[PDB]
Design an enzyme around this catalytic site. Sequence first.
Site, PDB file in Angstrom:
ATOM      1  N   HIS A  19       0.840  -1.228   0.000  1.00 17.48           N
ATOM      2  CA  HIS A  19       0.000   0.000   0.000  1.00 17.48           C
ATOM      3  C   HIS A  19       0.868   1.269   0.000  1.00 17.48           C
ATOM      4  CE1 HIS A  19      -3.308  -2.811   1.149  1.00 17.48           C
ATOM      5  NE2 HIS A  19      -3.918  -2.033   0.244  1.00 17.48           N
ATOM      6  N   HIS A  31      -5.854   7.468  -3.430  1.00 18.51           N
ATOM      7  CA  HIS A  31      -6.904   6.583  -2.857  1.00 18.51           C
ATOM      8  C   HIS A  31      -6.402   5.837  -1.607  1.00 18.51           C
ATOM      9  CE1 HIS A  31      -5.029   3.137  -4.792  1.00 18.51           C
ATOM     10  NE2 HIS A  31      -5.845   2.367  -4.072  1.00 18.51           N
ATOM     11  N   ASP A  32      -5.093   5.681  -1.397  1.00 17.82           N
ATOM     12  CA  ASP A  32      -4.554   4.941  -0.218  1.00 17.82           C
ATOM     13  C   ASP A  32      -3.578   5.827   0.582  1.00 17.82           C
ATOM     14  OD1 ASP A  32      -5.771   2.287  -0.022  1.00 17.82           O
ATOM     15  OD2 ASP A  32      -4.479   1.552  -1.624  1.00 17.82           O
TER      16      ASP A  32
END
Length: 313
Positions: free
Chosen positions: A68, A106-107
């Site tokens: 991530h 988004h992360d």
Amino acid sequence: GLMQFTLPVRLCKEIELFHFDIGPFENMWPGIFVYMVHRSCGTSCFELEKLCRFIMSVKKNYRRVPYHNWKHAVTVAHCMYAILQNNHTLFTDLERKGLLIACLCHDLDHRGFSNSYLQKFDHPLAALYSTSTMEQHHFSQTVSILQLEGHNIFSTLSSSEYEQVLEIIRKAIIATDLALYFGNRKQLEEMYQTGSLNLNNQSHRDRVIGLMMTACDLCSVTKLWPVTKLTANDIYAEFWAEGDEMKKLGIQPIPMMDRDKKDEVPQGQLGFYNAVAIPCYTTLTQILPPTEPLLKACRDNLSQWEKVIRGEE
Ligand SMILES: Cn1ncc(C(=O)N2CCC2)c1C(=O)Nc1ccn2cc(-c3ccccc3)nc2n1
Ligand SMILES: [Mg+2]
Ligand SMILES: [Zn+2]
């Protein structure tokens, strides 16, 4: 204005393909992203000075976790770029602007732990956001960076266009919560089958954009087998770290997160392709036919995991 980004010939060609890998040269990834914004959106969409400052602040707020990380952000934005470029006329000027930025952000500030682990740890983010905990945080971090002096890449939008783009980004980032994917795809499956799917219906577009976000987020399963297989190692590095942390709280983790059960990864990946990945790209291909190469690549990778189980690799 007259300053284009250009990639070397192999990247200039392969970046257009769904299965493109952005490569191991971290210093080329910002240029790859700007290139995609310029071709997808226009050389005018953003002030280059502001975009460049936004990109480097986003990079800084991704952590050094196995999966991530900043590479994932750019990888997910490239999948969105390929979807947008193969579906030219279906998306508004604002949507093309918003969705590449949504994918990059988004992360933001992911720690490598699921919503479940935060809840069981009793992390402060779990008290602030009861559902889609990390995804509400990722959107919060996006707004924070947009409000740094010199970082508002949307400054030239009207008040209402600005509220619309931030609403596109918010829904797109929330939709990356896989807990929400199952019901989103089921509703889309029914609407497509009963013929009620209507892309002029805002709530319908929202659902379609949500599925695009799941498709881009899972796009590791749509790469060439060697990329898919090596990304899996990074994904399982996080899962097993979380498993370790579950055992420290005195909770047996699910098999997916238990490093003792490495043996069962091939079968675990089968369940995942069958329960999540294949249905996702199938429904996406029904709604946007030119995304079929994502479904074909996913089916090829499913077949590769079947070969691992059978001992052929
Ligand atoms: C590749 N890819 N891409 C995205 C995700 C994914 O999930 N997101 C990333 C943040 C969340 C995955 C994935 O690999 N997900 C699952 C999902 C269910 N599983 C079950 C087992 C299992 C393993 C050993 C033993 C037993 C079971 N393995 C699983 N893997
Ligand atoms: Mg996420
Ligand atoms: Zn992600």
